[PDB]
């Protein structure tokens, strides 16, 4: 039998220090091909090791197809092949789109569903997993208006995180590195920021905020570790909740939710499962 391995690379949809992402074609079917830089080879090994341990299958987790290592004359070529989501990242989608109540709730509940799936241990099953790099660039928008979580290169089972999204205990190095729940608490912090990014784009009474990244008003682009620690740990600043949210019952309930993700004390933060329940009772 013929094992068809040819993937036509059609267009580069991402370039960075990590390497590149391509829209590709396999047997007439779009796939996403992440080609890792030598700089980020450990992310390919960690994602491959995780999927060799547990084949994650969830509508809100980016769909795994293949890990490929190919021998080159002077080098090793590393590809991760996944489902392709043509609408792109939540980050990209929020730039150019506003949301209504239904589409705002559908987005954040689908992210919470993917995150609770990562976090939960199932006996028989899956280990508990923490993402450790949750952000709007690591979330893809599907045509049915739900999202899926991408990039398990930093994932831990039971490189550092994007500094803009680091929880206080990571910035001040008090995180209990031996406690698995510590890593879930770090993801909940970052989930609260993503919730804030999305909520800003939900229209109420004819008003919407411009897309902005978390802490846009208090740190530079490519903020330093020190920049983030002063804002988050020393001054204990949190993203602004605009007054206009308090005229809307959905945005009021989401403000409360994001506040309960942002406690300085990691152990006070909501679990992914509690966030899910709260979101199902909203509207
Ligand atoms: C090596 O590499 C790649 C391979 C493939 C690929 C292509 N055709 C068929 C297959 C296939 C799947 C499953 C079986 C089963 C049959 C039943 N038996 C009891 C166990 C084995 C056989 C064959 C694969 C895995 C695609 C790839 O990319 C999309 C590959 O990576 C480049
Ligand atoms: C990696 O990805 C894709 C792979 C394939 C593909 C190609 N040949 C054969 C297979 C296959 C057949 C049979 C078994 C099982 C079924 C019975 N069991 C008891 C033992 C053996 C497993 C696998 C597949 C899945 C198609 C895809 O989509 C069209 C893939 O996605 C891009
Ligand atoms: C976060 O990380 C990973 C993401 C992906 C991935 C999967 N589907 C689609 C995309 C994508 C497609 C298209 C656009 C743009 C380009 C055209 N136009 C301007 C609007 C849309 C953006 C993004 C990506 C980037 C794959 C990965 O692995 C193979 C990733 O890493 C784990």
From Swiss-Prot:
GO terms for cellular component: activin receptor complex; apical part of cell; BMP receptor complex; plasma membrane. Changing residue 159 to P: In FOP; variant phenotype. It is linked to Fibrodysplasia ossificans progressiva: A rare autosomal dominant connective tissue disorder resulting in skeletal malformations and progressive extraskeletal ossification. Heterotopic ossification begins in childhood and can be induced by trauma or may occur without warning. Bone formation is episodic and progressive, leading to a debilitating ankylosis of all major joints of the axial and appendicular skeleton, rendering movement impossible. Residues 7-283 form the Protein kinase domain. Its cofactor is Mg(2+); Mn(2+). The active site is at 133 (proton acceptor). The chain holds residues 202 to 499 of 509 of the full protein. The gene is ACVR1. Expressed in normal parenchymal cells, endothelial cells, fibroblasts and tumor-derived epithelial cells. Interacts with FKBP1A. Interacts with FCHO1. Interacts with CLU. Interacts with type II receptors AMHR2 and ACVR2A. Interacts with BMP7. Interacts with GDF2/BMP9. Interacts with BMP6 (when glycosylated); the interaction may induce HAMP expression. Interacts with TSC22D1/TSC-22. This is Activin receptor type-1. ATP binds at residues 13-21, 34. It is a single-pass type I membrane protein. The keyword Kinase applies. Bone morphogenetic protein (BMP) type I receptor that is involved in a wide variety of biological processes, including bone, heart, cartilage, nervous, and reproductive system development and regulation. As a type I receptor, forms heterotetrameric receptor complexes with the type II receptors AMHR2, ACVR2A or ACVR2B. Upon binding of ligands such as BMP7 or GDF2/BMP9 to the heteromeric complexes, type II receptors transphosphorylate ACVR1 intracellular domain. In turn, ACVR1 kinase domain is activated and subsequently phosphorylates SMAD1/5/8 proteins that transduce the signal. GO terms for biological process: activin receptor signaling pathway; acute inflammatory response; atrial septum primum morphogenesis; atrioventricular valve morphogenesis; BMP signaling pathway; branching involved in blood vessel morphogenesis; cardiac muscle cell fate commitment; cell differentiation. GO terms for molecular function: activin binding; activin receptor activity, type I; ATP binding; BMP receptor activity; cadherin binding; metal ion binding; peptide hormone binding; protein homodimerization activity. The keyword Signal applies. It is found in: Membrane.
């Amino acid at each position: 039998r013929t094992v068809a391995r040819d993937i036509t690379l059609l267009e580069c949809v991402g370039k960075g220090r990590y390497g590149e992402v391509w829209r590709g074609s396999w047997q007439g079917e779009n796939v996403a091909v992440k080609i890792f830089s030598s700089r980020d080879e450990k992310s390919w090994f960690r994602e491959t090791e995780l999927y060799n341990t547990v084949m994650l299958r969830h509508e809100n987790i980016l769909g795994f197809i293949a890990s490929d290592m190919t021998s080159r004359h002077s080098s090793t070529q590393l590809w991760l092949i996944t489902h392709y989501h043509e609408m792109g990242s939540l980050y990209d989608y929020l730039q150019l789109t506003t949301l209504d109540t239904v589409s705002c709730l559908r987005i954040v509940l689908s992210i919470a569903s993917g995150l609770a799936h990562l976090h939960i241990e199932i006996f028989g099953g899956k280990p508990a997993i923490a993402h450790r790099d949750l952000k709007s660039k690591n979330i893809l928008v599907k045509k049915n208006g739900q999202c899926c979580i991408a990039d398990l290169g930093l994932a831990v089972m039971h490189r550092v995180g994007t500094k803009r999204y680091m929880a206080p205990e990571v910035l001040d190095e008090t995180i209990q590195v031996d406690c698995f729940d510590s890593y879930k608490r770090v993801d909940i912090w970052a989930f609260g920021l993503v919730l804030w990014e999305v909520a800003r784009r939900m229209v109420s009474n004819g008003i919407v905020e411009d897309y902005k990244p978390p802490f846009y008003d208090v740190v530079p682009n490519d903020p330093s570790f020190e920049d983030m620690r002063k804002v988050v740990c020393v001054d204990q600043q949190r993203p602004n909740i605009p007054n206009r949210w308090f005229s809307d019952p959905t945005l009021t309930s989401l403000a409360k939710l994001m506040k309960e993700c942002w406690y300085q004390n990691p152990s006070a933060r909501l679990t992914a499962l509690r966030i899910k329940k709260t979101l199902t009772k909203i509207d």
